[PDB]
Structure formats: C-alpha cells, structure tokens
Amino acid sequence: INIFNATFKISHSGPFATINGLRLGSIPESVVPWKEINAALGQLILLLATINKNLKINLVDYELQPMGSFSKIKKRMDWLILPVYYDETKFDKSLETTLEIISEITRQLSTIASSLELPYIMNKDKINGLSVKLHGSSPNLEWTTAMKFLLTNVKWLLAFSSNLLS
C-alpha cells in the first residue's frame, strides 16, 4: 500500500462509504450520528491537506484546515470560513466547495504528471448527477450515495497522488 492508502482506508459498509471505518452518510433505516459524519469529514479534509502537503500543491483560492470534527475550508471571496461539519446552509456550501477543491487538486496533479482524471463528474453541487447538499434536512439515500461517489473520486485521487510521488 502507498503512503496515503496506509493512513486512509476508503471502503464501504452496507450502503455507506467509509473512511477508516467512519460512515460518511446516513439513511432513515440506519441512522448515523452527526459526530461520526463530522469526524469522517474531518479525516477527508486531513486527507486532502496531506495530498497537498506531500505533492507540493498550492491552492490559491482555498485553504484546508483539518480540525477534527470542526474542520473548515477557507474560500477566497478576504476569506470566507466554511464549516465542514453539521451542528442553502453553510454546510451545503462546504460540501460543494470540497468538490471544487477535489477538481482543482486533480487539475494540478495532471500538470505535475506531465512534467489523471476522476471517474465521476463534478459540476457545482453535483457529483455523478447527485447533490452533496441536503439543505438543512437530514441525510437520505441520495446524499449518502453522493458521498459514496465523492469518496470513490477521492480514493482515485489518492492513488494518482501516490503514483506521482513514486
């Protein structure tokens, strides 16, 4: 396993995609506590910052701030601090921005490679056609699946980042 795969195991349990065992999503049948969801998001943000740190990726308009269950993203607009956790909404904007960031890291990764593409398309708040936003409402199967697509995209991003470091 690579240096990233070693610390971040992205897999799936039942209908939930998981990162180091933490389920990123929640459905009425099997409710996942926000503490778990926020910790999962925290690990994702840390994972992304890890890739940027190691591959020397410079994000001009964004700044990742891993902070456990209260992780944040600073978006230049001076900067707007978005909460990548819960407890339309600022949370919704953090998730869409996470997609923007994944796209940007991917773009710079391909640049570095030349001197790389993810499986699911990300357009605004939608990944593979599903929205990462729940507008204040509680998680549903759609959002849970959208998150599954997001982590799959990240799992690939991870792989590429590792191949390059070789």
Textual characterization of the structure:
Strands 1-2-3 form a three-stranded antiparallel β-sheet. A three-stranded antiparallel β-sheet has the order 4-5-6. Strands 7-8-9 form a three-stranded antiparallel β-sheet, covered by helices on one side. The chain has one domain: Actin-binding Protein, T-fimbrin, domain 1 (Orthogonal Bundle). 38% of the residues are buried. The chain has 166 residues and is of the alpha+beta class. Helix 1 (34-54) runs parallel beside helix 3 and helix 2 (90-114) runs parallel beside helix 3 (141-165). The two termini are 12 Å apart. The protein is globular and about 50 Å long. The chain is 43% helix and 19% strand. Component of the autophagy-specific VPS34 PI3-kinase complex I composed of VPS15, VPS30, VPS34, ATG14 and ATG38; and of the VPS34 PI3-kinase complex II composed of VPS15, VPS30, VPS34 and VPS38. Belongs to the beclin family.
Q: How many distinct folded domains?
A: 1
User: What is the CATH topology assignment?
Assistant: Actin-binding Protein, T-fimbrin, domain 1
Strand content: 15-25%
Helix content: 40-55%
Largest sheet: 3 strands, antiparallel
Rg over C-alpha atoms, rounded to the nearest angstrom = 15 Å
Helix and strand element order: EEEHEEEHEEEH
- Just give the CATH class: Mainly Alpha
Number of DSSP E strands: 9
PDB class: protein transport
Keywords: targeting, PI3-kinase complex I
Assembly: monomeric
Entry title: Crystal structure of the beta-alpha repeated, autophagy-specific (BARA) domain of Vps30/Atg6
